[PDB]
Amino acid sequence: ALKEYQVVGRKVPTEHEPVPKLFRMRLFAPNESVAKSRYWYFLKMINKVKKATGEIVAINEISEPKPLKAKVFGIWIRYDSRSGTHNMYKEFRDTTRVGAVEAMYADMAARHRARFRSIRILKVVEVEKKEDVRRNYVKQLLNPHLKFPLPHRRTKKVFAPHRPSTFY
């Protein structure tokens, strides 16, 4: 349900800073309210600007330019754990940045038991060259002659009359 949001904001004008700098972030959140909340969260930790003394100057939703093209996205994240000392880089093959990020969130939760609060996404980039891909499974999907059997066939009306064929 995520949506990529470009949020631009700045601290309120003051006598010491008549022309405050504008900071912009591309961050993924279910809605605009959370997107602004995370945006102030990152600025509050870096540039010394609070939501009380700052303001959101622009909010925009970024849609995927080519959602009908299969791509590979490499994501750097700062995973937070029981020890909290972890940097992860992962690669996911998908057609949209939002889809790749959502797949990343599910993957981190499933494998390392990471929540939305623990994970923060450092950067999402598109890998265009096959040789740049370092993940074996992604390269296996990049095999020119990819082909595999259909897995998990599984196919109310209880009490079927004949034994299922569950095959080809």
Partner: protein
């Protein structure tokens, strides 16, 4: 168990400020207090005469009596389920005027003034303070202020 002396647990309240010990400033004795004046009680440890109780340190009240070297202050003290009027005779060394009442008096003077010119011009004047309004719509120019894109920083080991 407790000891219930008058100056018990007043070690830090009645202590003189750091590098503020010694002779008391002389301007304290040259201020005139009249009945109805608002005063803040702040006990000075140097003058041990006319001291109020440690409850009245930091309390604000209205002067009801003026004496040769002291001032009668009316404080309302919470006693169970009611307010009790407490009349403390405190020497002027422990008393100072409340800047809030001054500021109110200057605001009253300004409000009466604004009313005078308003009636002279035949217009109505806005005299009541308003809480901070919500921010107005305004433009923000990006000329020579191009937004810089920020990304969260990776973890580093710096002790």
């Amino acid at each position: 168990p407790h000891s219930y002396g008058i100056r018990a647990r007043t070690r830090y309240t009645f202590q003189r400020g750091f590098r503020e010990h010694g002779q008391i400033r002389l301007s304290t004795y040259l201020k005139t207090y009249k009945v109805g004046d608002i005063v803040d009680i702040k006990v000075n440890g140097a003058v041990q005469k006319g001291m109020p109780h440690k409850y009245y340190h930091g309390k604000t009240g209205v002067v009801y009596n003026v004496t040769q070297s002291s001032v009668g202050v009316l404080i309302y003290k919470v006693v169970g389920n009611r307010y009790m009027e407490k009349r403390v005779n405190v020497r002027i060394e422990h008393v100072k005027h409340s800047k809030c009442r001054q500021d109110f008096l200057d605001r009253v003077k300004a409000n009466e003034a604004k009313r005078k010119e308003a009636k002279a011009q035949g217009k109505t004047v806005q005299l009541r303070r308003q809480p901070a309004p919500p921010a107005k719509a305004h433009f923000v120019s990006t000329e020579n202020n191009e937004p810089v894109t920020l990304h969260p920083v990776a973890y580093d080991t710096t002790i």
